[PDB]
Design an enzyme around this catalytic site. Sequence first.
Site, PDB file in Angstrom:
ATOM      1  N   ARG A  35      41.054  14.539  45.525  1.00 38.95           N
ATOM      2  CA  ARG A  35      41.598  15.694  45.459  1.00 38.95           C
ATOM      3  C   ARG A  35      42.928  16.171  45.718  1.00 38.95           C
ATOM      4  NH1 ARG A  35      37.203  19.729  47.032  1.00 38.95           N
ATOM      5  NH2 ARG A  35      34.861  18.574  46.815  1.00 38.95           N
TER       6      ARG A  35
ATOM      7  N   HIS B 118      32.697  22.368  39.651  1.00 39.92           N
ATOM      8  CA  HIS B 118      33.482  22.578  41.215  1.00 39.92           C
ATOM      9  C   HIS B 118      32.902  24.120  41.923  1.00 39.92           C
ATOM     10  CE1 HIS B 118      37.164  23.084  43.407  1.00 39.92           C
ATOM     11  NE2 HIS B 118      37.208  22.150  43.369  1.00 39.92           N
TER      12      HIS B 118
ATOM     13  N   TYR C 165      39.046  41.112  34.182  1.00 36.21           N
ATOM     14  CA  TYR C 165      40.114  41.294  33.798  1.00 36.21           C
ATOM     15  C   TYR C 165      41.011  40.603  32.693  1.00 36.21           C
ATOM     16  CZ  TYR C 165      38.442  45.889  35.896  1.00 36.21           C
ATOM     17  OH  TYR C 165      37.757  46.616  36.520  1.00 36.21           O
TER      18      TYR C 165
END
EC number: 5.6.2.2
Lengths: 477, 477
Positions: free
Chosen positions: A3, A49, A93
């Site tokens: 990661r 994820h 949005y």
Amino acid sequence: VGRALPDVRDGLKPVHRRVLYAMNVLGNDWNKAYKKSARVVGDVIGKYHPHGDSAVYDTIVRMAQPFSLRYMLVDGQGNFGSIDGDSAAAMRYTEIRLAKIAHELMADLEKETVDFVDNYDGTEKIPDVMPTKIPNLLVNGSSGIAVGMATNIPPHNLTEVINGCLAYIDDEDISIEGLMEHIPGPDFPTAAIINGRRGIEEAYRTGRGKVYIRARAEVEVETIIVHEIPYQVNKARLIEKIAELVKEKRVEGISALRDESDKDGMRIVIEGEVVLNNLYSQTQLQVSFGINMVALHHGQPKIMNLKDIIAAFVRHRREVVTRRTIFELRKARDRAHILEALAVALANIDPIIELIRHAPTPAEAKTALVANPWQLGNVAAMLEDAARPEWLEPEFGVRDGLYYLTEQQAQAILDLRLQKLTGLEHEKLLDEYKELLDQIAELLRILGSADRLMEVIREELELVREQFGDKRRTEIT
Amino acid sequence: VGRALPDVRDGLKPVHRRVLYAMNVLGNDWNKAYKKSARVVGDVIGKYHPHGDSAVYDTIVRMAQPFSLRYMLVDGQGNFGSIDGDSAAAMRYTEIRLAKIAHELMADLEKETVDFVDNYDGTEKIPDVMPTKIPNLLVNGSSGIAVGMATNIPPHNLTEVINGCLAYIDDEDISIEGLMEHIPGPDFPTAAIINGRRGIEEAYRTGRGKVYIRARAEVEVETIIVHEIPYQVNKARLIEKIAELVKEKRVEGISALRDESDKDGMRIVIEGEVVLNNLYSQTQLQVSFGINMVALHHGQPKIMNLKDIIAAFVRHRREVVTRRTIFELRKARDRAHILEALAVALANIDPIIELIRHAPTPAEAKTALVANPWQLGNVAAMLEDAARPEWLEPEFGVRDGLYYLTEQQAQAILDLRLQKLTGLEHEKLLDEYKELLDQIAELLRILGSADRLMEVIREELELVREQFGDKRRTEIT
């Protein structure tokens, strides 16, 4: 462990890969309409994820910001933040879609070019890496300060990195200097200038090297106006830095400080040249960049140099293209095989239909079709080898002027739609067949010649430099 | 305004509806395998409720907890919390699926039984309400304390509410008393006893009424052991409440306090009866419940009584069943219509095939098919009306011993798969056709008779009481 570090091959981390992969599965293309970020985030949280929407969204956001990426991976539409720390708008949005170049990262993903690992619940597969045609690690960079597994690779100019790649291909024993003939140094999306040229030569030569990024500023007659600042600096926290320095008088003597940064450009107005130089030494107008080129190579952390990184890309493009070629070849055989049966089926439709209309169930019609060999009508000259699947048993296919159908080929015939019996639909299957023969021979021509294979890679790189290569931003002194 | 109040018809809020609707679209059924909560949450965040994964997950969780719902809507597998405030496990660990009864809430959702409103981005539709067969508002209840729009409807026993519903149907002018002959009072999933019986009679009669829920406790000889406590109380915060009262000596005199609550039952052990009574008056062992029956009726807030709530359900079941009947009827016509053309097509396959095999393109074959009427082979006695779509033009269908195909019917024929020409596949289309005729006549029989329609509703309710009705929990004194 993984990661923290990016993969040299594609320059992404599990998150990035997951985010982009999901967008790919969503058909969230650059040529299609935008989608709400929420749509993508939620798809990622639930399939790849599952670690909070906030985290994932921040990833989508950073890949959309022109000041964060040298070549943006996400085409975002809306308030995705600004250089002054402005946080992006809510996911419900903002609208996004894969950037033109992002498709180049996942180009041929379908053609079994990369390995696929399981997701958290084992219901979905995710590519180990992306079959990228873009040298993403160098081009967009990668930062991170984790448990001994830190990295700091700056962005670069695509055109330059491509030429570097081509050069490496043309002569493997190329030096870091010859490589720097094309890639002189980093190229930031925002940043304006890099002074220390030796830090680059050192970083490229060994993987590590501190460099200095300075702001492009000038005086006017009385006033110091900064057009562009160093990479990763918050313009707001810089104006404030200067402010609390002129207040404490740390910075010799300044009049009025005003940020006139509009949409077209940038204006950090501060009201001779002695002011500017003393400013650089105490403000963010100049920043160091400890280049640490550490990435995941062969599933292992490595301090790689410029060449190591380029070599890693090219070798990936080798595997990808080969694996693509092997796939296209198998796909080609399998289709020509299905076409053979279909061509044969339509050359003797009357006896085919007769068998079907009298066979009670489709299974029985299936047995009667494969039970006895078929006459090759006008398709006798078309079938008269390498178009046959490497898995097919020799007791099938044209053996002695007659065609021996497989159980599958019979189902294809059985699944035939009436409309496919027309004049046009008939030719499309015959023409497709003839095309495949030319195609398989070509793919074999490729697999055989180790030169033709590398020549395929070269052409791809020259193609990306044309349609995606742009001008250099950061100046190198 | 609407987020605060539940809809009398289904007893859910936008969130609940969205969560369950998404599960329905995911095929996340009770008979299929469990799915990670993450899968559902992310699907909801991206398509229906894009307001943070935490919120949505909490919704999924509450509908899974046996202590939160009288009849759980979500079948959860894992740590979904406990009566001691234990928070549920992460969404990437817990597994869920629509509870058996949840499918009853969305029963016939497909059959155009309810109106559908747009989602946040206008790409997805969501039902205005659920075509529920379960009186969810009463059964599971609904709480909320918002801007003047508060509600507090307690749970009830399904068996009891169903009988109440049936009773209302059998005699509309039934009183609240006659209604209470079946529904004596609330029925909590956890809670054990309700003393104030008049508060119920008042709440049911006018929509509002305070009731008292007490813990079922007894002494043993010396020790007070509470088997079950009031609805919505945190057992942990109750042990602690008692603790900081015995410490301050507020509660006369207690020895040792021990929570022996295992998996099989519950044990709030506290070490005569004077201790228990004085405990009730100062602890959570007894709680008030200001019943406030406010819900969304006709898109408007209303203080409804027991009858108003039941009447609202029944009228919904009326609309749903009718709208379902109208759909099944139109669906029926449309299929029989497609079957007619197919039956006709297969009764003269040779001239059909001839036309197709000679028509260059499928469009041309389409013109030639509808250009001239067709002979009715053995299907002459099958076609000889009401099975024809109310939208079909009179110039189509069997007119004078010949069949006039529509442009659509021709495409169906054209899309016919060769396997459909066999003996078995042929009958399945003819048998299906004959079934529809019986079916449409039945649906018309239903639409005509306002008695047969109500008799359909009754049978559904008696069916839910059988397969879903259970024993009463809360005792009423």
